[PDB]
Amino acid sequence: MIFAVRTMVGQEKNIAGLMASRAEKEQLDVYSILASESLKGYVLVEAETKGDVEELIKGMPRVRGIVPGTIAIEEIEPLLTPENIEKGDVVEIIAPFKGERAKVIRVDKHKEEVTLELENAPIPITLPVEGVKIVSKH
Amino acid sequence: PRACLKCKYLTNDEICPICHSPTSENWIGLLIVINPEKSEIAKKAGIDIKGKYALSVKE
Ligand SMILES: [Zn+2]
């Protein structure tokens, strides 16, 4: 029974913060609130009833109203459970060298980068891990 | 604030209150858990403790 609130874009986190506050102060049965970078314009609010949310957002600034229907906890699960490469793994670059296969040579667990020895043609390329998908594993 | 590298808990301190683990500023997204007992989202994510949480964190 998770709801979806249409806000101003870029104010999702701001509004979530105040939603949390009003709900504790006013004792409304709001259980979690979710603001994902990928879900701009929307703050997901988990609540007992729609009325709670209508009472929550009543006179909220930069809030444009509640979207009809609920969203299930099936559909939110991708956003709530976001690598693990090893030196020697072969990968394909998915984002200047798109479609190019390459062996991994240095894995940066800190900067979350990966250093790649292309199969084609001459120098090591380093990429965020985001920009590469594993193809073979050794 | 900042976000713990381990558990994603949001704080201003350089070490996390929940477990004394290092916190970073480079955190993205936000999950506010008002009630852990009654949140199916918090169940799924696996948050025991009420509080604000980042969704992703890096150094
Ligand atoms: Zn922590």
Strands A90-93 and A42-47: unpaired
The C-alpha of A75 sits at a distance from chain B's nearest C-alpha, in angstroms, of: 11
**Residues A5/A49, Cβ–Cβ less than 8 Å:** no
Expressed in angstroms, the distance from the first to the final Cα of chain B is: 14
The C-alpha of B5 sits at a distance from chain A's nearest C-alpha, in angstroms, of: 11
Length of chain A (residues): 138
Spatial distance between the Cα atoms of B49 and B59, rounded to a whole number of angstroms:
23
Closest Cα in chain A to B27:
A37
Q: How many CB atoms lie within 10 A of CB B34?
A: 23
Q: Which two tokens stand for residue B27?
A: 């955190």
Strands (E), B1-59: 2-4, 10-11, 23-24, 26-33, 51-58
Residues 6+ apart with CB under 8 A from A17: B32
Q: Which two tokens stand for residue A107?
A: 């894995």
Spatial distance between the Cα atoms of B59 and B14, rounded to a whole number of angstroms:
12
Q: Which two tokens stand for residue A93?
A: 């670059």
**Residues A104/A88, Cβ–Cβ less than 8 Å:** yes
φ, ψ for residue B56, nearest 5 deg:
-135, 150
Spatial distance between the Cα atoms of A92 and A114, rounded to a whole number of angstroms:
12
Strands (E), chain A: 2-7, 30-35, 42-47, 63-66, 90-93, 101-108, 113-118, 125-128, 132-136
CATH fold for domain A83-138: SH3 type barrels. (2.30.30)
Chain B interface includes A17 (CB < 8 A): yes
Closest Cα in chain A to B39:
A31
For chain A, residues classed under CATH 2.30.30.30 are: 83-138
Helices then strands, counting H and E runs in chain A, come out as 2, 9
**Residues B42/A32, Cβ–Cβ less than 8 Å:** yes
Residues of B in contact with A111 (CB under 8 A): 59
Mark which residues 11-40 of B lie under 8 Å from A by CB: 28-35, 38-40
φ, ψ for residue B41, nearest 5 deg:
-60, -50
- Ligand 1: distance of its center to the CA of A84 in Å? 21
Residues 6+ apart with CB under 8 A from A54: A66
Residues of B in contact with A73 (CB under 8 A): 40-41, 44
Pick B1-59's CATH classification: 3.40.50.2000, 3.30.450.20, 3.30.70.1230, 2.20.28.90: 2.20.28.90
Q: Which two tokens stand for residue A90?
A: 């072969």
Question: SS3 of B47, please?
Answer: coil
Resolution, given in Å to one decimal, reads 2.8
> Per-domain residue ranges for chain B?
1-59
Q: How many CB pairs below 8 A link A and B?
A: 71
Spatial distance between the Cα atoms of A14 and A93, rounded to a whole number of angstroms:
36
Q: Which CATH superfamily is domain A1-82 in?
A: NusG, N-terminal domain (3.30.70.940)
Residue B16 marked in a binding site? yes
For chain A, residues classed under CATH 3.30.70.940 are: 1-82
Helix pair A12-25, A50-57: axis angle to 10 deg: 110
**Whose CA is closest to A18, among A47, A61, A48, A51?**
A61
Experimental method: X-ray
Spatial distance between the Cα atoms of A33 and A30, rounded to a whole number of angstroms:
8
Residue B12 marked in a binding site? no
Spatial distance between the Cα atoms of A24 and A33, rounded to a whole number of angstroms:
12
